[model samples]
Target: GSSGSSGKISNIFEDVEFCVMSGTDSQPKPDLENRIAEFGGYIVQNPGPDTYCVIAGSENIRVKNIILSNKHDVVKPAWLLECFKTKSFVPWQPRFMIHMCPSTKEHFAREYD
Candidate 1:
């Protein structure tokens, strides 16, 4: 791929910041931050206003709480891996949406299919 004027390689995730919560200090299989680096994206600390997505394991309470309370897109680590593998953003279907705020879930359910 061609480099941009800023010397950054062109990548789809450049504009998206991700908050990854893997439930363990040890690295997860896909290593979300490394993949983000490969794609010119950032792994952020908070799922704040600037974040584009949150990737977490199923059992992470903090992630679950974020999904249950925030408006950000919540998806599984698999989605990150899939996006990196395909070099494109894949739709986060219900299966990949392991956790979600009730209202958001209600709102987005129709869009899943």
Candidate 2:
């Protein structure tokens, strides 16, 4: 069996399946869903076992709880954006994970500064 790595000859999200929470700004042009599609990922509505990961924003409590309860990888929207911007897969870092209200958008911004 193949190691399942993209190696140097594939799209980073070639076959990755992602679930975007409704709270995320997927309505805007070139939104998360659109970006994911551009990078070769399939977007799904529900966060199921087959879902590779979930992208969540501050207002995504429902989906966030679902991902956490199911023990799935719930990542911040920034994680996806940064990956797309860098054109590579960036490992999830603790600080990048969205938390409760105390973790504001400013906190996320400060990390890059």
Candidate 3:
């Protein structure tokens, strides 16, 4: 059986590629660190009670999978696609402690193939 457009959809990950780092809080894995760093980046910060990291890189660098613990007015459409298509109904937007910064906010909108 298939769900209609407004119905529940299965396998959202079917179109996305992602990686989750576990056991990180338990200990920092140098091997994992090196692998991510190889992509022109490193975990400058971690998820904690104090500081947070941004998802975007500076003008000269690329950023990803960073800790966004604390920051200022971070706003984004609840649905990633909504950011590009403003006419989305229900306009799922997210506003919370996890905020993206100015350096990479504009660029983060771009997706990779």
Candidate 4:
């Protein structure tokens, strides 16, 4: 029921199982897999879209509710891929905390910044 950084460090979703299907897309389907491997990260909810989310932590249990919603707010065509390095850094407060209040609060705030 839970996943992300540390524990699995994988983009392999055995449940739904279709999202992380590598080599399926002929045009280099390196979105999920490559992102994870390159950053040593994990995709908690790979609902691939304008609002994709991921987690990258040194230790899973050591952290909780850490998710980065890759929002493409400006360019309209480029996904921001904002790394929500909650536990990964000291956290910036307002934008990282207050801004993410409603969308990522309930769960994130209960655990980390």
Candidate closest to the true structure, highest TM-score: 1
Instruction: Please give the lDDT score at residue 72 for candidate 3.
Output: 27
Report the C-alpha lDDT of model 3 over 25-94, residue by residue, as the tens digit. 2233243233333332334443333322222212111222343322322222122223223322223223
CA RMSD (A), model 3: 15.1
Misplaced by over 4 Å in model 3 are 1-11, 19-65, 68-92, 101-113
Q: What is candidate 4's lDDT per residue for 1-113, written digit by digit as tens? A: 55665453332222321123222233233453544444444334343443333222122331222323323111110111333122221323323231233544456566654
Residue 29 shift from truth in candidate 3, angstroms: 19
Instruction: Name the Cα RMSD for model 2.
Output: 7.3
Model 1 Cα lDDT, one tens digit per residue, 1-113 = 55655533337787778788773345473487777767778777778888777887666677667766767666777767677668787776777886666677887777756
| Pairs with backbone N, CA or C atoms under 3 Å apart (clashes), candidate 3 | 52-69, 53-67, 78-92, 78-93
Report lDDT (CA) for all predictions: 0.71, 0.67, 0.30, 0.31
Q: What's the ranking of the predictions by lDDT, best on top?
A: 1, 2, 4, 3
Weakest 10 consecutive residues, lDDT, candidate 2?
Answer: 1-10
Q: Given candidate 4, what's the lDDT at residue 14?
A: 22
Model 4 stretches astray by more than 4 angstroms: 1-37, 46-90, 98-113
In model 2, state the lDDT of residue 91.
Answer: 75
Best by lDDT: 1
28-88 per-residue lDDT for model 2 (tens digits): 4237787787787888877776878777765456775774564565567777877877888
TM-score of each: 0.71, 0.64, 0.20, 0.20
Model 2 lDDT on a 0 to 1 scale: 0.67
